[PDB]
Design an enzyme around this catalytic site. Structure first.
Site, PDB file in Angstrom:
ATOM      1  N   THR A  79      -3.848   2.259   8.974  1.00  0.00           N
ATOM      2  CA  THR A  79      -4.386   0.927   8.722  1.00  0.00           C
ATOM      3  C   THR A  79      -3.270  -0.095   8.536  1.00  0.00           C
ATOM      4  O   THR A  79      -3.419  -1.261   8.921  1.00  0.00           O
ATOM      5  CB  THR A  79      -5.321   0.948   7.510  1.00  0.00           C
ATOM      6  OG1 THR A  79      -5.948  -0.330   7.366  1.00  0.00           O
ATOM      7  CG2 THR A  79      -4.568   1.281   6.238  1.00  0.00           C
TER       8      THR A  79
ATOM      9  N   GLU B  83      12.562 -23.394   5.237  1.00  0.00           N
ATOM     10  CA  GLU B  83      14.016 -23.301   5.104  1.00  0.00           C
ATOM     11  C   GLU B  83      14.469 -21.872   4.835  1.00  0.00           C
ATOM     12  O   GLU B  83      15.308 -21.608   3.977  1.00  0.00           O
ATOM     13  CB  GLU B  83      14.495 -24.242   4.005  1.00  0.00           C
ATOM     14  CG  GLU B  83      14.339 -25.691   4.375  1.00  0.00           C
ATOM     15  CD  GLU B  83      14.567 -25.906   5.847  1.00  0.00           C
ATOM     16  OE1 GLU B  83      13.568 -26.005   6.586  1.00  0.00           O
ATOM     17  OE2 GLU B  83      15.741 -25.970   6.265  1.00  0.00           O
TER      18      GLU B  83
ATOM     19  N   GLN C 178      -3.120   0.341   1.878  1.00  0.00           N
ATOM     20  CA  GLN C 178      -3.082   0.707   0.466  1.00  0.00           C
ATOM     21  C   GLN C 178      -1.804   0.221  -0.205  1.00  0.00           C
ATOM     22  O   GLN C 178      -1.840  -0.261  -1.343  1.00  0.00           O
ATOM     23  CB  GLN C 178      -3.218   2.217   0.308  1.00  0.00           C
ATOM     24  CG  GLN C 178      -3.367   2.650  -1.133  1.00  0.00           C
ATOM     25  CD  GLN C 178      -2.964   4.087  -1.347  1.00  0.00           C
ATOM     26  OE1 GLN C 178      -1.903   4.366  -1.900  1.00  0.00           O
ATOM     27  NE2 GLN C 178      -3.809   5.009  -0.913  1.00  0.00           N
TER      28      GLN C 178
ATOM     29  N   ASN D 110       6.445  -1.481  -7.567  1.00  0.00           N
ATOM     30  CA  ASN D 110       5.724  -2.664  -7.106  1.00  0.00           C
ATOM     31  C   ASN D 110       6.129  -3.908  -7.885  1.00  0.00           C
ATOM     32  O   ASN D 110       6.086  -5.023  -7.353  1.00  0.00           O
ATOM     33  CB  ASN D 110       4.218  -2.434  -7.215  1.00  0.00           C
ATOM     34  CG  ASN D 110       3.771  -1.180  -6.504  1.00  0.00           C
ATOM     35  OD1 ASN D 110       4.135  -0.943  -5.352  1.00  0.00           O
ATOM     36  ND2 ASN D 110       2.985  -0.360  -7.189  1.00  0.00           N
TER      37      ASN D 110
ATOM     38  N   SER E 219       2.596  -1.346   4.622  1.00  0.00           N
ATOM     39  CA  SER E 219       3.439  -0.189   4.877  1.00  0.00           C
ATOM     40  C   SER E 219       3.275   0.270   6.320  1.00  0.00           C
ATOM     41  O   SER E 219       2.215   0.108   6.930  1.00  0.00           O
ATOM     42  CB  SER E 219       3.097   0.949   3.918  1.00  0.00           C
ATOM     43  OG  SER E 219       3.908   2.083   4.171  1.00  0.00           O
TER      44      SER E 219
HETATM   45  N1  GTP Z   1       6.187   0.936  -2.362  1.00  0.00           N
HETATM   46  C1  GTP Z   1       5.020   1.550  -2.203  1.00  0.00           C
HETATM   47  N2  GTP Z   1       4.788   2.306  -1.072  1.00  0.00           N
HETATM   48  C2  GTP Z   1       3.601   2.936  -0.903  1.00  0.00           C
HETATM   49  C3  GTP Z   1       2.612   2.827  -1.865  1.00  0.00           C
HETATM   50  N3  GTP Z   1       1.547   3.544  -1.450  1.00  0.00           N
HETATM   51  C4  GTP Z   1       1.837   4.099  -0.254  1.00  0.00           C
HETATM   52  N4  GTP Z   1       3.110   3.738   0.096  1.00  0.00           N
HETATM   53  C5  GTP Z   1       3.818   4.120   1.330  1.00  0.00           C
HETATM   54  O1  GTP Z   1       2.915   4.131   2.417  1.00  0.00           O
HETATM   55  C6  GTP Z   1       3.174   5.231   3.264  1.00  0.00           C
HETATM   56  C7  GTP Z   1       1.892   5.717   3.931  1.00  0.00           C
HETATM   57  O2  GTP Z   1       1.012   4.636   4.143  1.00  0.00           O
HETATM   58  P1  GTP Z   1      -0.145   4.337   3.068  1.00  0.00           P
HETATM   59  O3  GTP Z   1      -0.080   2.907   2.592  1.00  0.00           O
HETATM   60  O4  GTP Z   1      -0.007   5.295   1.911  1.00  0.00           O
HETATM   61  O5  GTP Z   1      -1.525   4.635   3.837  1.00  0.00           O
HETATM   62  P2  GTP Z   1      -2.286   3.462   4.626  1.00  0.00           P
HETATM   63  O6  GTP Z   1      -1.359   2.314   4.937  1.00  0.00           O
HETATM   64  O7  GTP Z   1      -3.465   3.010   3.801  1.00  0.00           O
HETATM   65  O8  GTP Z   1      -2.803   4.144   5.986  1.00  0.00           O
HETATM   66  P3  GTP Z   1      -4.086   5.113   5.953  1.00  0.00           P
HETATM   67  O9  GTP Z   1      -3.805   6.242   4.995  1.00  0.00           O
HETATM   68  O10 GTP Z   1      -4.350   5.663   7.333  1.00  0.00           O
HETATM   69  O11 GTP Z   1      -5.288   4.338   5.476  1.00  0.00           O
HETATM   70  C8  GTP Z   1       3.790   6.295   2.374  1.00  0.00           C
HETATM   71  O12 GTP Z   1       4.814   6.978   3.058  1.00  0.00           O
HETATM   72  C9  GTP Z   1       4.367   5.531   1.203  1.00  0.00           C
HETATM   73  O13 GTP Z   1       5.771   5.511   1.294  1.00  0.00           O
HETATM   74  C10 GTP Z   1       2.839   2.070  -3.004  1.00  0.00           C
HETATM   75  O14 GTP Z   1       1.965   1.970  -3.860  1.00  0.00           O
HETATM   76  N5  GTP Z   1       4.047   1.430  -3.170  1.00  0.00           N
HETATM   77 MG    MG Z   2      -4.626   4.724   3.595  1.00  0.00          MG
END
Ligand code: GTP
Ligand code: MG
Ligand code: GTP
Ligand code: GDP
Lengths: 49, 431, 136, 430, 431
Positions: free
Chosen positions: E137, E246, E11, E220, E132
């Protein structure tokens, strides 16, 4: 040399025609774009009906 | 002055002929009533002297159902009224009925009409015949017509586009019995045969066309495109032209081995065909993708014998040869050792036509590919197992015997399929 | 199609005389006037047939033709607006379009099917190193 | 006759060569379309040294361009005066060298050099009487530093009796924009010393200092630096194209300036250079020109000539003058500054005069001098190289492409030997 | 002839990709539909041959919530309909789920699409992957994707723009667990990894942009600007260009040490952007300012391996050289012993682009700075301490154990982090 320069004058003319033959190729690639815009969008609206 | 006669026998043949003739009429600009609104069409149609055009097609059936659909449909004025032959009693999934009992009273009319049509032609290239094999009258009348036309004509080539049953999806329960029998008759009487298993086309309609509930109308439109792409070299101008006689000279290594299978590309819906370029480089790669085959067979399980590619559109001959070398150097496609050169390619300038109300998209380049490969031996092996399982306990045999069929004819058909399998097995090995 | 192209050898055999007998230039002027003769010989072909700072280009899109698209789904009220679709809501205006453009053009390099290797046979000829006249 | 062929490589080399060709075309009165628009007869008497004759009567440079990426060539073709170059002479890769001497000398260069060597052979075969080669390349970049050395090696193998000149830009400790500079600098110097007939080193730091102090212009640019380098390059070979009181070609210059085979590194300079406001106040004569000649901050290298001793030096004058005043000036300068001049080779200054001054100037001078002070650059480069190499930093890229530490050790030892024997003559006495 | 493929998994990756792609479309003038109303887009896009352009991107997720938002928004027409791969059941913050149970049922399709995309390219420079760590995932599919790519493609450069959990601010409770496994996987498969933790970006917004309620939309956009500054040298002409190749050739002293953090400048609101001249002399100091790092780390506690900075706008090459000299002469910024010179500088002509509805002002210059320093060991140490705290009592272990993951998988990751800390400590000392 006077007859000489007359000879190479013809190659320059032959150059110009070759460039125009490239120009009509640019006109050729208009065909797919022309046939893309107006009419490929219509085939997406046939299923909407 | 080059013609071709098309024979439609059985419900499947008739229902694919409806679509193919709609496509032909649309392609040549002929209205449904036959009039041309204000010379290439001579391959399929014939002039009446002033105005309308009459197709070179004859429709055969024993049930008056689908014929009456045509005789009252929008195409009622197109076909010749007295070449839509109809019977009284259906064969009813019985092979002996359509070959020994009720086909002998109707085969006389079809032969007379075929003779009348041929006498009008002058450069007859050959015959096209469409028939469903897993049925009674389709297999029964199909065998009789080929047998009669053989001794009636001789050297005229015959092209058959048959529909064998799928490995696991089929309607009838006695279809393994008559599929074997008809293959015996057509093996020694048809010059080129194409495999058109139903299950394969269902999957193609899914993955490419994004259709969740396909129907027989969708499949019949796919086959019409194949026929048109195959026969466009006769009636349209191109850089490299190929005739019907220039098919059985490049695809049939031995007189027995002429059962082949087809493919088509690109097949894709308009909602996503315009996100990509559809270059000649990849559409020729997709034609060899096993999932895109029009018969439920795996070409990776055997070698290739000879492959024919028919390009139409604005393809460049240099680009075609550049893609062929890639196919040759690919390691997952294997040709037989005694065939160093295996491609015969033809090119046409006419872009593919699109039928309104359909599902396909229109592209600048299309390739239709016919390949003869040793992998076609598996469809015979799986068909033999079902027939053996049923014939061990002799189910439904009494139905066939009582219609004038000798008991011993079942065994003879079984033996020759084994001979064909052994022929494929012995020819597929290297020297 | 040139008329001078059709002149042929064996017509070089005797053909009149360009300089008449009554206007023969003296030896003195012929020596003197070799400067222009050499000058004329060198640049005759050059005048007959032979004839900084970076700059930014215009931005491809004009202000009047952005053609913003309408979203596929039908939302009813601002209550159901979600922050995920905040991107792209506002069409660009005159102020924020870039003033200058410096794109990379690869038309020239979109050529040269490949490099060349001389698959030929010498044809060098030796021009000697010292006062060519003893060469062959 | 006695023509010379130009070859360039790398982004720095291409930018130097483009400005050099603009300067040459401006000197010879050739428009960007290859048509002569000059006025004097001398401008066409010796145009065959640098140019070829094509159909229609147009002139084309006999230049060969080598690179690993198409961007630089596509830019130089679209730039001004770019229509002169023949498309066939362009040879380039598609992947890039990546500032990696190993990549540009063993992996990509090894396969690419066939075409460029073919083109060079064709150009040198078509000429009447070959005089030599001149090369513009950088010693801090991958493709330049690698392919320049490799191509020098093979061209020296093929033509052992010619003259080879290299105009190299070496990295300085002050303005450094590459973290791998010492490595490929040492590797390039090790190969260059064994093959190059003449090498002239240029410093970006010195160029910026010159622009800031002598020209006194607010915003220097690579265009201006390339202009200075191009003027310096045209100065050495001007007397080959134009008659003069004492003409002297590249081979004569080499014989006069090189006492021993391995001491062939020169430091160059140009005069006069005056700011826009002070031109009308200064008097342009031989004394002022020799002042700005032997002046230390007019040099194009970071080495200070007064920190060592001059071995030999040469001055190339352009324009009308008298030989007596030039000889008197050289004799007076050498007599008075005898402390900075080595003693066992008395009268160690050579002078040459050309009769065609640069356009817009009545008098100009180009200075080439062999001084013992250039060892400072080698010393600082070696110090940086050994500091970065004792810990084997940034080394796995070199070691992963057929190269081992043996080559690094050999190159370091060879450069150290060069420095030792080059310092030997700073203290050697008769 | 230069290309780069961007992969967005998770996500966070999808939401960053939305901003980055709207930024790229605005920068190159491509409308959200994809129809333009000379050839610079080729780095990120691809002409279809007639009109529309499609991005070289692929979107992966296991839940349909975020992807369906994209397929319905204004940017729906831009992407190919098939290159948005979505699953059915979420990983639910479980690394073992996304690497052993349900991640294996999606990797094949994603790899097939990656192969299809890379076949189109000709000069593929490398890959950009966004994910992330603190999610199933993001961690599960990321590790599998990089592991499969490292053996499918090999020597192509891969750049990971990864977001680690903040030292104290986080939304999950089990993210210390699945953070360690991600490091163990990527340390041996990623060429360059960038630290972009959330808390540091939170402080930058409140301090400079005068935003008191920063939402994920604001954060973002900064990542998008960093990517644009990094890759502008590939598609805009400049005095000193730098390729994707590079970065690793100059910023990686040893193959194990490739963890590095970024900094961007200037970031000033438009209400106060015109009270200062934003000179190149001063913006380069803001890049090196210790508290402006995009990762919550203190450069004052360690030495520098090397630093790469890229300028875009109207900078002068003589201007930056003086600034680098000033930075070197500064005594509080100390470089490592065996690195006499450690700066790699690039310059580009194209100024940064401003998006409507954004927060940044319009300026004539910008700096993007990528540095490698010994101080990055602190995030590893603190995450290690958190892992040691939670793993002491076997907390949450059964969730990972029940999904096919062995009990001993944590010990090897712990030993890997210990070895990485040892390597950083050993490298950091002088000679
Ligand atoms: N910079 C930024 N970080 C994000 C954003 N959305 C989620 N995160 C970070 O992602 C971490 C958790 O992972 P997520 O991306 O939310 O969830 P996921 O990667 O889809 O994993 P699942 O929930 O199991 O599907 C959180 O602690 C946030 O700090 C975003 O839109 N921008
Ligand atoms: Mg997720
Ligand atoms: N491709 C295609 N196949 C069809 C269609 N309709 C029927 N079939 C095939 O025809 C086979 C059975 O034959 P029938 O449709 O009953 O027609 P028949 O072969 O003449 O046999 P009868 O019923 O006695 O007339 C089935 O297995 C189907 O696969 C169709 O519309 N399209
Ligand atoms: N004089 C001059 N030097 C340049 C120019 N462009 C780059 N350089 C120098 O060249 C060095 C980088 O060399 P590089 O481009 O990597 O060489 P390449 O690898 O052969 O292409 C930098 O340190 C610059 O100082 C230019 O236009 N003029």
């Amino acid at each position: 040399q006077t007859k000489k320069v007359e000879a190479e004058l013809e190659e320059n003319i032959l150059r110009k025609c070759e460039e125009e033959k490239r120009y009509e190729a640019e006109k050729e690639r208009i065909l797919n774009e022309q046939r893309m815009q107006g009419r490929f969008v219509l085939q997406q609206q046939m299923l909407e009906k | 002055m080059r013609e071709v006669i098309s024979i439609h026998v059985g419900q499947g043949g008739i229902q694919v002929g409806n679509a193919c003739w709609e496509l032909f009429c649309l392609e040549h600009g002929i209205q449904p009533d036959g009039q041309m609104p204000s010379d290439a069409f001579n391959t399929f149609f014939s002039e009446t002297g002033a105005g309308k055009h009459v197709p070179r097609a004859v429709f055969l059936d024993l049930e008056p159902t689908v014929i009456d659909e045509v005789r009252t449909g929008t195409y009622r004025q197109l076909f010749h009224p007295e070449q839509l032959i109809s019977g009284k009693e259906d064969a009813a999934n019985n092979f002996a009925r359509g070959h020994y009992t009720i086909g002998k009273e109707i085969v006389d009319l079809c032969l007379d009409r075929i003779r009348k049509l041929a006498d009008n032609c002058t450069g007859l290239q050959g015959f096209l015949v469409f028939n469903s094999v897993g049925g009674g009258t389709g297999s029964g009348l199909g065998s009789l017509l080929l047998e009669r036309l053989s001794v009636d004509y001789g050297k005229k080539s015959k092209l058959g586009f048959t529909i064998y049953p799928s490995p696991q999806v089929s309607t009838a329960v006695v279809e393994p019995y008559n599929s074997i029998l008809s293959t015996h008759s057509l093996l020694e009487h048809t010059d080129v045969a194409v495999m058109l298993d139903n299950e394969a086309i269902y999957d193609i309609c899914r993955r490419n066309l994004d259709i969740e509930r396909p129907t027989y109308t969708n499949l019949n439109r796919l086959i019409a495109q194949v026929i048109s792409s195959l026969t466009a070299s006769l009636r349209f101008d191109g850089a490299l032209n190929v005739d019907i006689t220039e098919f059985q000279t490049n695809l049939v290594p031995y007189p027995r081995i002429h059962f082949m299978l087809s493919s088509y590309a690109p097949i894709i819906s308009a909602e996503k065909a315009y996100h990509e370029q559809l270059s000649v480089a990849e559409i020729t790669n997709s034609a060899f993708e096993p999932a895109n085959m029009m018969a439920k067979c795996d070409p990776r399980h055997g070698k290739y014998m000879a492959c024919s590619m028919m390009y139409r559109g604005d393809v460049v001959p240099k680009d075609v040869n550049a893609s062929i070398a890639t196919i040759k150097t690919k390691r997952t496609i294997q040709f037989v050792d005694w065939c160093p050169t295996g491609f015969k390619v033809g090119i046409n300038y006419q872009p593919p036509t699109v039928v309104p109300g359909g599902d396909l998209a229109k592209v600048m380049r299309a390739v239709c590919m016919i390949s003869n490969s040793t992998a076609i031996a598996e469809v015979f092996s799986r068909l033999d197992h079902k027939f053996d399982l049923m014939y061990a306990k002799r189910a439904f045999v009494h139905w066939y015997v009582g219609e004038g069929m000798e008991e011993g004819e079942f065994s003879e058909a079984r033996e020759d399929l084994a001979a064909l399998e052994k022929d494929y097995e012995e020819v597929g090995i290297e020297t | 199609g040139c008329k001078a192209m059709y002149q042929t050898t064996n017509n070089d055999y005797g053909q009149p005389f360009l300089q008449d007998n009554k206007t023969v230039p003296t030896y003195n002027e012929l020596v003197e006037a070799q400067t222009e003769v050499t000058r004329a010989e060198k640049q005759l072909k050059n005048k007959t047939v032979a004839t900084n700072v970076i700059v930014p280009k215009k931005f491809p899109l004009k202000e009047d033709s952005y053609k913003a698209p309408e979203p596929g789904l039908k939302i009813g009220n601002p209550l159901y607006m979600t922050a995920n679709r905040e991107y792209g809501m506002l069409k660009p205006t005159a102020f924020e379009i870039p003033n200058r453009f410096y794109p990379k053009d690869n038309t020239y390099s979109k050529s040269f099917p490949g490099m060349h290797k001389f698959d030929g046979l010498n044809t060098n000829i030796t021009f000697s190193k010292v006062h060519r006249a003893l060469d062959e | 006759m006695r023509e010379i062929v130009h070859i360039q490589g790398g982004q720095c080399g291409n930018q130097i060569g483009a400005k050099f060709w603009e300067v040459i075309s401006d000197e010879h009165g050739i428009d960007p379309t290859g048509t002569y628009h000059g006025d004097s007869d001398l401008q066409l008497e010796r145009i065959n040294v640098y140019y070829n004759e094509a159909t229609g009567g147009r002139y084309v440079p006999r230049a060969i361009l080598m690179d690993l990426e198409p961007g630089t060539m596509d830019s130089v073709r679209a730039g001004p005066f770019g229509q002169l170059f023949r498309p066939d002479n362009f040879v380039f890769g598609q992947t890039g060298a990546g500032n990696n001497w190993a990549k540009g000398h063993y992996t990509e260069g090894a396969e690419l050099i066939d075409s460029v060597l073919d083109v060079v052979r064709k150009e040198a075969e078509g000429c009447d009487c070959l005089q030599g080669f001149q090369i513009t390349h950088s010693l801090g970049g991958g493709t330049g530093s690698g392919m320049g050395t490799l191509l020098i090696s093979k061209v020296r193998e093929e033509y052992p009796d010619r003259i080879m000149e290299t105009f190299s830009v070496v990295p300085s400790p002050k303005v450094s924009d590459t973290v791998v500079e010492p490595y490929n600098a040492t590797l390039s110097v090790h190969q260059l010393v064994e093959n190059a007939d003449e090498c002239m080193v240029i410093d970006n730091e010195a160029l910026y200092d010159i622009c800031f102090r002598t020209l006194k212009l607010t915003t220097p640019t690579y265009g201006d630096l390339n202009h200075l380098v191009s003027a310096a390059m045209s100065g050495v070979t001007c007397c080959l194209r134009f008659p003069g009181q004492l003409n002297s070609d590249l081979r004569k210059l080499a014989v006069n300036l090189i006492p021993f085979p391995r001491l062939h590194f020169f430091m160059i300079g140009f005069a006069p250079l005056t700011s826009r406001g002070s031109q009308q106040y200064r008097a342009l004569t031989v004394p002022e020109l020799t002042q700005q000649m032997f002046d230390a901050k007019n040099m194009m290298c970071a080495a200070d000539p007064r920190h060592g001793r001059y071995l030999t030096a040469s001055a190339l004058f352009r324009g009308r003058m008298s030989t007596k005043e030039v000889d008197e000036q050289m004799l007076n300068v050498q007599n008075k500054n005898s402390s900075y001049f080595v003693e066992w080779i008395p009268n160690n200054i050579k002078s040459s005069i050309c009769d065609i001054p640069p356009k817009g100037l009545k008098m100009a001078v180009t200075f080439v001098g062999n001084s013992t002070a250039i060892q400072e650059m080698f010393k600082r480069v070696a110090e940086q190289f050994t500091a970065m190499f004792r810990r084997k930093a940034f080394l796995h890229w070199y070691t992963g492409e057929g190269m081992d530490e043996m080559e690094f050790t050999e190159a370091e030892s060879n450069m150290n030997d060069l420095v030792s024997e080059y310092q030997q003559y700073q203290d050697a006495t008769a």
